[PDB]
Amino acid sequence: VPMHPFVKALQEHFTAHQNPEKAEPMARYMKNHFLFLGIQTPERRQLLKDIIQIHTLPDQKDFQIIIRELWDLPEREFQAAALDIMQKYKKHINETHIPFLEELIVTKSWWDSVDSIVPTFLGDIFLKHPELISAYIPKWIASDNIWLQRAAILFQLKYKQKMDEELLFWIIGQLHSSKEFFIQKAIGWVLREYAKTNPDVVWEYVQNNELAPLSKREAIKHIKQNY
DNA sequence: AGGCAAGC
DNA sequence: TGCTTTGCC
Numbered sequence: 358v359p360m361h362p363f364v365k366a367l368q369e370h371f372t373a374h375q376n377p378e379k380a381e382p383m384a385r386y387m388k389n390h391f392l393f394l395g396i397q398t399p400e401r402r403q404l405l406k407d408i409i410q411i412h413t414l415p416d417q418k419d420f421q422i423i424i425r426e427l428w429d430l431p432e433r434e435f436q437a438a439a440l441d442i443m444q445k446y447k448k449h450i451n452e453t454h455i456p457f458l459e460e461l462i463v464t465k466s467w468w469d470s471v472d473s474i475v476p477t478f479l480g481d482i483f484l485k486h487p488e489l490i491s492a493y494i495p496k497w498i499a500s501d502n503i504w505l506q507r508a509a510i511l512f513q514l515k516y517k518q519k520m521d522e523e524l525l526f527w528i529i530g531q532l533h534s535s536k537e538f539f540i541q542k543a544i545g546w547v548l549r550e551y552a553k554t555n556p557d558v559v560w561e562y563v564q565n566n567e568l569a570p571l572s573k574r575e576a577i578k579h580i581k582q583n584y
Numbered sequence: 585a586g587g588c589a590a591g592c
Numbered sequence: 593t594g595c596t597t598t599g600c601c
């Protein structure tokens with residue numbers, strides 16, 4: 358049972374605003390891996406805002422406590438809310454929190470939580486601490502955990518001109534022979550996105566290095582008409 | 585406001 | 593495959 362007063366307040370307020378008619382299709386969309394209360398993103402964020410306006414944002418010493426307690430609640434909106442909360446503490450998040458973020462990635466894993474952790478929170482940490490990438494990314498690739506592998510692929514997704522091209526291509530080469538949908542698809546996504554910034558090097562990469570056909574097709578869907 | 589981004 | 597609905601930017 359959650360014990361932090363902020364989490365208890367949030368749980369009560371979310372539960373009081375549940376919508377069972379939305380809960381069923383929301384849970385089906387995530388392959389019924391999770392129960393849902395039936396609260397979509399606009400309403401979920403406003404309910405969190407209500408609780409912050411009443412109680413104020415808890416002290417930064419508590420932010421991991423709060424996120425952990427929310428992660429253990431059954432309904433999926435509590436994990437989505439915990440990530441909204443983590444965004445409000447981002448000035449206090451640094452390299453010492455990478456293991457905490459790893460834990461969140463591999464606990465109650467699915468594409469919604471993992472994608473909300475990786476390009477923003479890990480992306481920002483490794484921009485400030487790029488000399489720490491080698492302590493994590495190769496480990497994640499070798500772990501055979503598909504969500505840490507997707508993290509290795511997508512932490513640079515929002516980098517645009519900051520992208521470390523040789524690193525991106527090494528990561529992708531290490532994972533290109535994965536059978537896994539969420540890995541093949543992440544490779545396609547990150548290549549398509551980076552092609553918005555540096556289309557010529559993505560084209561050269563895709564024409565000279567092996568990729569699953571899903572990955573290759575997705576990578577080039579916007580630039581192929583230029584060649 | 586609208587374009588671009590899993591499910592089946 | 594290319595349409596769905598909702599979410600991110």
Ligand SMILES: COc1cc2[nH]c(C(=O)N3C[C@@H](Cn4cnc(N)c5ncnc4-5)c4c3cc(O)c3[nH]c(C(=O)N5CCc6c5c(O)c(OC)c5[nH]c(C(=O)SC)cc65)cc43)cc2cc1O
Nearest residue numbers: 379382383386397469472476514515589590597598599600
């Ligand atoms: C950094 O850069 C980016 C990060 C990004 N994150 C997301 C994202 O996180 N997405 C996009 C979008 C999921 N999504 C939707 N449409 C598409 N066409 C998509 N293509 C891919 N994903 C897609 C989505 C999430 C996350 C979620 O946690 C989501 N949850 C739902 C959802 O819950 N859905 C979608 C389908 C659906 C619901 C839902 O609530 C419902 O509740 C009623 C639904 N009812 C029905 C029906 O009765 S139809 C017969 C369908 C239905 C959508 C959804 C997009 C995105 C974009 C970026 O550039």
Ligand SMILES: [Ca+2]
Nearest residue numbers: 542575590594
């Ligand atoms: Ca698609």
